[PDB]
Design a protein around this ligand. Structure first.
Ligand SMILES: [Cl-]
Length: 288
């Protein structure tokens, strides 16, 4: 045979990480005394309707003064649906959450009434113990999830580019993850280090930029430049096995790596971005 070893390397990269199933829980958070908007109520109902095999819950907090007025508003609006409000205090692992370093900052942030900044922390704690899919009340459910399985047990959206930043960022919503996922844990570790270091920058706390940085440490290929570098290395490796000029191709027609070979190498990192065909992101936090 010829090129059978090179074709074996390409096939190894396609299934290097087996896809792990995701628990069928849709976690959504709405904490504070502000009432949920009419749009977010309709999107939440649409979320539960499009996922009858998922149990959809909206997580509120009873440790915030004035929470009853907003919680009473949600129950009357969701009493005839599959949306079941669950208090984070009444969780079956709340005593373990109190022993988490991030929960002290969660308590410290809700006291300052920075509810959106606190939601970035709680969503990772819920995915740590229970797992499943976190989604925000503003995220639009395009189609139902069904049985989802992701390489490394982690599913995210396509990364966006901040209009002034220099690095892309994966949104921290929606996030699909297995129970006690390494990417979720590393995001919590970086979040604790940022809060320990008094990071006044809201981006360098528990938001998408921190979730992205933790995703790159566990799965370095998620960085577009890293995967692109890996494709250029296979291009040179194929030329060496072909006994062709060991050089980077000048034009596209001179590339030896076929499109099918590029797709095989990129298969794991495409699947991790699989949540983009199920959910459309909302911009409620943008207007805030
Ligand atoms: Cl060979």
């Amino acid at each position: 045979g010829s090129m059978q070893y090179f074709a074996q390397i390409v096939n190894r990269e396609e299934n290097k990480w087996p896809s792990e199933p995701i628990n069928k829980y849709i976690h959504m958070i709405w904490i504070g005394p502000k009432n949920i908007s009419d749009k977010n109520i309709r999107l939440s109902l649409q979320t539960a309707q499009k996922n009858p095999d998922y149990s959809t819950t909206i997580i509120y907090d009873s440790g915030i003064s004035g929470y009853e007025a907003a919680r009473n508003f949600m129950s009357e609006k969701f009493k005839a649906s599959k949306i079941t409000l669950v208090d984070i205090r009444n969780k079956g692992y709340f005593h373990q959450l109190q022993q988490e370093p991030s929960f002290t900052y969660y308590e410290e942030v809700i006291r300052n009434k920075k509810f959106a900044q606190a939601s970035d922390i709680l969503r990772l704690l819920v995915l740590k113990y229970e797992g499943g899919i976190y989604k925000d009340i503003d995220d639009i459910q395009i189609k139902g999830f069904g049985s989802l399985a992701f390489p490394k047990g982690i599913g995210v959206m396509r990364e966006y580019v901040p209009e002034a930043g220099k690095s892309a960022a994966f949104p921290n919503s929606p996030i699909a993850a297995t129970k006690n996922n390494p990417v979720v844990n590393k995001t919590l570790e970086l979040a604790v280090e940022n809060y320990r270091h008094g990071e006044k920058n809201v981006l360098k706390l528990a938001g998408p930029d921190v979730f992205t940085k933790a995703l790159y440490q566990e799965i370095p290929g998620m960085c577009s430049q890293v995967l692109g570098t890996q494709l250029e290395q296979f291009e040179l490796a194929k030329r060496q096995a072909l006994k062709m000029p060991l050089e980077k191709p000048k034009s596209f027609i001179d590339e030896q790596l076929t499109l099918q070979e590029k797709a095989k190498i990129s298969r794991p990192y495409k699947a991790i971005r699989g949540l983009s065909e199920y959910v459309c992101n909302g911009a409620d936090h943008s207007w805030a």
